[model samples]
Target: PAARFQVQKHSWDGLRSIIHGSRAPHDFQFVQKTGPHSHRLYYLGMPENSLLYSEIPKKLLLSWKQMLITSYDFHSESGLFLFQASNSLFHCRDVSPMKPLEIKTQCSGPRMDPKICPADPAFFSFINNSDLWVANIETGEERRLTFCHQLDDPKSAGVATFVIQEEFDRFTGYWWCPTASWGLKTLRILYEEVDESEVEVIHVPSPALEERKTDSYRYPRTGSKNPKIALKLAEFQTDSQGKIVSTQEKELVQPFSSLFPKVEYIARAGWTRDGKYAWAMFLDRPQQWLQLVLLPPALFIPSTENEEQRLASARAVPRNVQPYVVYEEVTNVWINVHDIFYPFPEDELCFLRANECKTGFCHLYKVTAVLKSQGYDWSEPFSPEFKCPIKEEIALTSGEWEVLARHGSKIWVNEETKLVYFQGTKDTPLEHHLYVVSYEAAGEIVRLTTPGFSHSCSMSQNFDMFVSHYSSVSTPPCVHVYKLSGPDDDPLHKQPRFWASMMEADYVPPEIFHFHTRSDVRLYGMIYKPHALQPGKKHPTVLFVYGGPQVQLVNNSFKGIKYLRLNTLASLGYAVVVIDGRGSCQRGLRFEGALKNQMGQVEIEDQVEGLQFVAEKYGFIDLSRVAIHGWSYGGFLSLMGLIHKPQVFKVAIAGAPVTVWMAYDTGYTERYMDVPENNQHGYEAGSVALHVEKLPNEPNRLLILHGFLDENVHFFHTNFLVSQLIRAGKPYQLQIYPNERHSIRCPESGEHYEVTLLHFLQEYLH
Candidate 1:
């Protein structure tokens, strides 16, 4: 047993190393190039693997054997190479150049900045308490750029808030103006300031008696006083040594309480292509109204005195000092927050994806910008009576279907050809394909990917080449490299120059299909048949669900169910079915927004309808022995499914489910379900705690799985569900993983969870 177990570790080690380290060993550290034609591939090498490069030709491998190299990036313009060694930044030039020059090192008072400077490759920026500082790459000298001497203040000037990262997915608070000169003069930084001092904190107690302590941090919930965020613009003047000598700060948008009296989020902020104006997307508290404001070069310094002094300052300001409202859109349903708003390379033109299509699907739009002189009279720049009307926009792409609007969606504009390459559901909702549409030509779209397959691409620096990765339910993912044929050639006629297959001989594929619900809604689903199925014999089924609006589960993409354990369950003669319900994204705006203002309520009905369809259509599905399982949003659906339709679902395993929307974050929860203060009925009906009384005592079993250290969906969700179950006198199963976060990342803990789930399903469903 010991000998066999030790041998098994070899196979596990091989896979674990590949997954943990890199997708492939050759590109382990993702090759960095000084330029496209540099003909040099500088990759990461471990200290233990220094001799590994010896087998290669001496000319091919550039060795820095003496120094333990870790992370590095070469500057194309400067010819200087920056690398992190011994937890400090060092710069050097040439392969065998002089000793590496130290730029910055980790100090006791404040550690070295982890972030690289975006505006300039030679320098980097960091935060010290509430102040901002920049370091010079040449001399290692540092100086405070933006000073904030707020004593014991929880407000950070140049750091991203927890809510921003958790919801908006923006990691940085500062948005550098792309057109800003790197000489350190006229350095314009668009940053957000978040005050978290007023936000409430929740405490999580430790398990061990010796370590019986509680951890607390500010985590704003729905209908709560969220962290106050202000979008601000600042300019810095640096001396000869690149040290900041002075600065000018201005509020791009009004104070959180004043400008947006009913606003909840400054969703996104960035500079325009020309860098003439800074813009921010503001969402109202109910998340229905969206306003896009453009800030001019000058600042609107509201007077500190009374109303009389404020009007006096308005006339005293320079030309173009006031912020102007460029565009505004209102909808009863919430607006989709996306990285779709981008300025065109040409002046007075911007492109965005919005629900302006005739069919109500999200389509690309060409929005014309009205200049200050063209639209309004700005003789008095600070005039409060000025109104600038944004030009009426025109749609670029339109259809009965929708475009890919989520994370993987790409809107690549080729300024050279005046065409935009975008990912959309042109062929089918189950698969996403790339299409190129001319900005000048309207409604003439050309599909790029091959029909009957899902595709995603990564274009090269030049628009001439692209690496396409594509797969389907029946096919494993494969890599393909293609060259741009030409403008004269048909987009469909061009094929991949090189193809690399990713399929193994023994690989299995899911059967892709769709079904219509009683509500006349078309729902897509994927079915994995049992490998050992016998004709005329029925098998127990497991419904894997994630009925959230942000993502779609049932797709044509190759999704092997190894970690999910669905494949393992199928091997044990269990059928697995995954459905894209009403709220699942990538279909269309209307389809995804079906459950708006009532998330958990409508999604459950769709999941149940899909389950009923599968059971009736497939005689081999054992309806009485059905089980539901999911994580996060899917986890919430698992609990909802069991409680709402206990007669259909025999068992359910919910991991880190949101028991109540009131406990969830403001940015995410308010967007979909509105505020708890406004939509009381929706929140009360959607909460798992309210329906715990409906759970059956026997035959129908439920398992609540959660991590004690879950930061995303806190362990409190599980605790709330458990409390309700206890109060209702209902018996349920519980599984808690210590030291595990939202995801059971620990290998041992995950293995134990898998075994426990299998045992529970076998004991009940069998």
Candidate 2:
């Protein structure tokens, strides 16, 4: 029989009703797309590979390639050009009609070559393998820089390389740094040049090769050798007729080094005020800090002024002539990469100092900037006493002791009241707390979001106004506006400006409560009771979870109801319970890191504690009908709970889970748990497949889902789990989404999975 549906808060684009029962179900319009950036209330019919136009301003409109809108800006300023940020070239606009005329030429594309100024705008650049010509927006003419920069042979990649997926899908090329200094005339450009590196072979013994059989595993383990890297700059200029006339190529980083010459990673670049020098941050493949590099203007400038002046002087007189002195400086700091340095003036800037905070929390610090201070020479280092600003930990109220999330850096501080607003959780994740505190004196804080279940707030660029979005376990998303006026009036007195009123949302609000675990330790959780509330009938419950390090599952803010809407699970007549176990973050750093070596133990115990809460408080929750579902690390825990505590949780659905830590990579698994070589006992105790005997008694239920092409957890996990189940004579179902990655994100595949999930849950829980 099919499960009957009621109302769901969240819906997808192709969502449909799957009838396995004889109950009348209400239809829901799937949210084809959502978020603040969406064009329509629900969706706009733009294919994933199509183009569209949106009007941001009457004159300043945007042209979007696909739904991402990668290019946006004001429409073409002149009839001769129709320009946008999509490409280096501007399109030709027909003057009379005012629509798109024709593509003129690819102007100012991505610049390659090491000799160009990374901070100048009107320059020739290279994007991807194809080099392109670019002309400044102010100028009209363009120039062709390079034919192509692709690796002559893909067989040989660079020596030291980090394969980032930033531009691969977007097709914008890689390591593109298009930045102009705060008040500088030049624009900075940086991109990566592919390295010709080869993959190594790992020999694995196979049963078929009885005598000397082995399979080749081209495994690029974490912390392994990376591809090689090199950086270049291209300089360009425009003549009087707005035509790109000159270009110079300079080599910034040479292919020279024993350690793969990995020092030339242009992660990000900022120009020194004078536009004579540029500051760049480079990181080793290991993610260790090589520190910031400060290069002199001559490094990027077309040619040495001295060389030119000396040439002219040699032709004129027999004399020793000096043109100008170019300054170059580089500093190395051994700290975390999260630290940021913002340039101040010529040679000084304020930066956040990492590895110095007593709380171990990332804090801020100030220091002398980097740039040479001088006269027109721009060589004198400024003479300002370096000072560090005091970092602050603002709280919610005088007695509020907890900090939920970290700094919402986007929110500007109110200068007059010294008040800054941040969203976080207090003692419990079920509460979304908005705190207003002073950066200087954070001891005094005010609690803004009282209900605090799932609250999402967007602060305007200025600190004066904010749109507070809130939701609970069973409640839909609610948008409210709050003003930071004098502390006298009721904050709620200011009516919340609603924007989603047109959309109909049917959701159930979860009842919040605390539950005690087996050890008598009290834990917090939430329970979403279905709307078809029977007088005395009990329904099965689904334990949705994400039990991982530094992640919170039990949260209360305006989003609790939205979760119920997903998959229409709650509407299918099952109770939903979300719990924050012992290892969850937001509570504190100590509590989060406490389960370091033991990742799933404490959290699983806490989840059962939540189940105990549901059984005791909600009489309608059927204990025997309980089930579990999760993804990624959550999938691992789902399997762990189903097998280890089969007597408690009846059914389990694990998605893309890591079956054995030994099969995983180094950076992620090894960093958390010592290599499998050292932790044999820990591995046995932690592995779900290790407890196959426990599954023989037919644990409540089990349904496994795997993405065949999942690189993260790999399909081997599901295979091993199924193998163990088969050996133990346990019954379980398996669903594999072909060619999917770590996440089942494909629209059609996701909708199918949702239906499958509902079908399975409704069978046992409902």
Candidate 3:
């Protein structure tokens, strides 16, 4: 029954139904496509959910048959919604005509991250040519922020650097101040200036226009000099008439580098609500230490001449105000960065913090900030000074299970009710369910949804209702609305169900299996078995391995288009297995800390054990004809399987694998393996090129695939490893994507990639 969906016709697109919707004041809305080149906006209201709704509701505002809608933004003050098209923006007030708006700028199309300021609804900001630009709807005058010297300059402002964007996943480098009212003397914005001058440069052959013979980028490798980060404040002063404005910039008198002496990255930075203090989170090179510092933007500046004068005046002006560290943490294992802080406090606390320190599991807490300085939070060389200005803390929730802190806000604070709604794996690691608890009162925590499926959710601003997007491997993605009634919050009510028919899909979900290791650890794995299986007969197996830190492969979620290739492979009679071993996230510190000093040296044996544990019970899996394949860290594991455990893996397809750990970026690499200078032995052990002799000397055993312009893993990894292969008289197949980045951008490249995988697997697996 599941064999109908193939990669050729691209039937996987039908599997996606749950589109993430943004929340409005009373209702939540989203833009869904109307099949071909057209999209329409919708609003589905969940009236305070004391009563379960029956029948399908509708609020189809408008449909665009001619224009292709990209995204929508909301203005709470003006009660207006704005959405962007190909090259233009349109405004609507839930009416027939979403009126078009234009700005006069010299730059072309493709402006990104549009933000309309609430202080002045007429003013807006966006990124153009790798720089932050501003304009007003009323006045046609456009303005430029930092990185204004030239487009190809060494520094880029208002946008995150490569490592910060790709590794840390913080997209924007700039933040808007949460101001109170409309008219103000000075409008301030905080942004980071990333100077990439000291980083290593790489160039790739390009098909685009001639800026040079090839496109070049500055990418810092492990142990290399990273991009210097500086936080700058741009304040625009409005005249008495409230017309045009003049701007000035400010910086910290003593930067993080001068204070800590070893600050590697500014992990996150933003303004406190009421614009009281500007705060930033910093991480050292090893990533074991982190500090959250709050700065008074008014005090930390040198009005004369920055860079030199700021440092020069630091010693002379010791009597005035200074920045204070609000929070500090030190961990034995590497610290994982996340978007987990909320600064807008209601009553007795300054902010809410997500920490994994005391209990070793992530939980929410209220942190009270002592605004006074805590004597610089400074450190001398290696010996630590670990004091912060934080006075008191109260834990909101506590349990053995960890919180889901990825991509979105894990915890939402409802100030009116003093409740914090969150997503966590309280029942089991397989599923993430929504739970509500109180910070003020030791209220009984309630799991809102029933278990057996994972959920993605968003609550309304008024705390009236929330949209619960739930799914499991056996079930399709379904969206539901739950509402809270009355004052103290009545147990939520829900709608009856769906009356309309769902889009058809020929799908078979993978099976989840669990086994206990002799080391007193439990392993979770999933496998896609062959559709037609005979009794006591075994089929070829493909172990899709991603045994590394920072990722969990198997979970209780709908395996939709993402697992398309695995489903198609199962259709063709191969058992595809996915294992989440030690060194994966959300399992707490000790689990992920397994790779602390080892990285590539660990993770292979657990994968082997998990595969064998499933194979022993399920006789349908053939151990003799097993192959390994994956991308990125999975790519690293594939080659590791071929080299370290050759007896188990017959063939390995390694895509965009990290050949040498030293060649990788500092943010991710230094977290696990430390710097190359500090751990030379670990760097050598982690290199695939160093162990090329362990791979089969003859042809057809190992295949490598990489994009020529892969900035993340880099093509040099494959080039260097293959260079070693040639010297050792070893033969291997190589596939290179000509005009591709870290991801396959070209449609033809992806189609060819799948074909290449199929041809290689068929010719070698049997």
- Structural similarity to truth (TM-score) of each candidate: 0.83, 0.63, 0.85
The sequence of per-residue lDDT tens digits that candidate 1 reaches over residues 283-318 is 776677777777665554432436555546545556
Native-to-model Cα distance after best TM-score fit, residue 379 in candidate 1, in Å: 15
Preferred candidate (lDDT higher): 1 or 3: 3
Listed per candidate, the RMSD to the true structure in angstroms reads 6.9, 10.7, 7.3
Which pairs clash in model 3? none
Off by over 4 Å in 3: 1-72, 80-94, 97-99, 107-110, 129-131, 180-184, 207-212, 240-242, 254-256, 306-320, 344-349, 373-389, 486-505, 745-747
Q: How would you encode candidate 2's per-residue C-alpha lDDT over 1-766 as one tens digit per residue? A: 1232323322333234542221100111111122233221111223332223221111111232222222322211221322232443333322022334333444333322212223433333333234534554445455544333431343211112223322011123322233433312333343334443453344544434346655554444433443444444554444445455555544332122321244424444444444544555555533333445554434333323475543342243211211111211121211123323433332234332222123433333233333333322112112211111223322223222343323222233444554555554543456665666554453544555656355655554344445455655555554444544554443322333332221123545666677666676556676777667774666677888887754665555444322534325556667788887776655544455546556566678778877876767777676777788888888888988876677778888888877777666543543345456665676667777777677535543777888876645767778887888788787878898874767766767776777777766655543
Comparison by TM-score, 1 against 3, better one: 3
RMSD value for candidate 2: 10.7
> Residue by residue across 327-444, what tens digits does model 3's lDDT show?
8777888677756887764222367788886678888888886654334421111233424446678887788888766666567787766777888888888887888877676567
Give each model's whole-structure lDDT.
0.66, 0.48, 0.70
lDDT value for model 3:
0.70
What's the lDDT for candidate 1? 0.66
* lDDT score of residue 616 within candidate 3: 89
Top candidate on lDDT is 3
